[PDB]
Amino acid sequence: GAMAKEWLIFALGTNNWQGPGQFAPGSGILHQGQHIAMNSLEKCHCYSIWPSDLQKTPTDRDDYRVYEIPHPIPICESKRWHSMTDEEVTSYCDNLLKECTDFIEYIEKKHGKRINLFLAHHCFMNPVIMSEINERRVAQGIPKVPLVVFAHGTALKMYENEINKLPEFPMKYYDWIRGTKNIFESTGHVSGVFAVSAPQKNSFEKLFPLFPQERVAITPCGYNQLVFHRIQGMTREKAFGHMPQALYDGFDATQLSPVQRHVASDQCIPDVNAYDRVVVFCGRFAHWKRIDSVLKAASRWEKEDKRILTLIFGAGSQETRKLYVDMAYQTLGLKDTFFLGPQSQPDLANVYTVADVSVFPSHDEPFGLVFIECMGCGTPVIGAKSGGPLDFVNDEVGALVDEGTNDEVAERVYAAVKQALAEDWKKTKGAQCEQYALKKFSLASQAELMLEFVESHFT
Length: 459
Ligand SMILES: O=c1ccn([C@@H]2O[C@H](COP(=O)(O)OP(=O)(O)O[C@H]3O[C@H](CO)[C@@H](O)[C@H](O)[C@H]3O)[C@@H](O)[C@H]2O)c(=O)[nH]1
Ligand SMILES: [Mg+2]
What we know:
This protein is an alpha/beta fold. Strand 11, helix 11 (369-376) and strand 12 (381-384) form a beta-alpha-beta unit. The protein folds into two domains: 7-222 and 442-457, Rossmann fold, CATH 3.40.50.2000; 236-441, 3-Layer(aba) Sandwich (Rossmann fold). The strands form two sheets. Strands 3-2-1-4-5-6-7 form a seven-stranded parallel β-sheet, with helices on both faces. It has helices at residues 26-38, 86-111, 125-140, 154-163, 174-179, 198-207, 236-239, 291-302, 318-331, 345-354, 369-376, 389-392, 406-422, 425-441, 443-457, and strands at residues 7-12, 44-52, 64-68, 117-121, 147-151, 192-195, 216-218, 277-282, 308-313, 337-341, 357-359, 381-384, 398-401. It starts with 6 loop residues before the first strand and ends with a helix. The longest helix has 26 residues, at 86-111. It has 15 helices and 13 strands. GO terms for molecular function: sucrose-phosphate synthase activity. Its EC number is 2.4.1.14. Pfam families: Glycos_transf_1 (PF00534). Keywords: Glycosyltransferase, Transferase.
């Protein structure tokens, strides 16, 4: 070959990117990372479209557009796809198709060159739309463009709910996407599927058994090292000293003991420099993140009076916030553990930078972006021996505790933190953490591999 492959990519997302007034789910963070990654590669341009009922399509950038919609993004499980009416499902898909074809028109005029990769997120309406966009192009005498799908799992779970005839999931999509659209019944529409985790690859392969397993693979995932790096001059007071406690609406401070009076809604953490060491969790408040294992480990170490400060970052519904706030303060008597809410990526880099250790004791973490972000800031990590972290957490960058009940994990997390603090892992592994993360997991290295994989195995 005389020249390197030039890529011109169009990427259709399911969720919003992270911006003002709207935090993004894992899926939307990944899409945004990938967009960043691919516009870094030498012979490569990526254009993206994604939906939001709040964020507005930009005025001074052309590299992405927002599909501005009148109601919250439909969820597989505010309103659900199965709750929508046909006319509403139809016009959501039809209007999005139109905005895609118009963006594609603009892109191909700007470059005097045809798009040569479609990327579609989730195994539902986005590959249906890009599949129809391809058929329309062939009919017009335009070359078709390989289509690659990112299985994140939410659409696959919805299909299983239809198959097992759960009540609020009458069969409406799975049989249609296999029997009428035939999206995954061959390689005629979709060239390859990237799954974020092994259970999603397994679930995809069971739900779409006519799709060649050779064309199914696990997504290489990167982190944004432009944002997640050791932050020069950072301080505890700058990093989290001005973040207010984020509890839940209607939280009653009178139900708390006197030694807990520092716990207060919308108040900052008092005198952050008095604490000896800082332990950080970050994650959405899902049950499999095992936040309760973090809170139980802290119940033990807070009894030892070593001034260990524990920070819980991440979002939850009012229900899950009440569960873990009340668990922390009424059930376990914590007083040096605080909830600080969801935060921007730059704010988290500052926190990781000043943390002694992070703990993410997930049960079957799909990949574990939080792990790589934290290490990329020069901080060690403690997780569990399940899911994605098994593949990349070793003893030089932190530790994975043995799987078990939530109570067993809690005791093992307590032992791991006590040992990280005693041996000052921050000092002895910190540098290795940033170098490991930077070299194996940067956004641009991982996208490069991904595209080489598309060319080697998805033709
Ligand atoms: O307050 C927060 C919390 C999270 N994040 C970002 O969101 C990412 C993921 O956080 P997480 O709580 O794990 O959300 P999930 O939706 O559960 O992430 C899913 O999606 C990721 C990318 O596909 C995978 O790495 C995860 O394992 C998978 O669970 C973080 O790494 C951060 O980049 C923020 O920016 N602010
Ligand atoms: Mg999916």
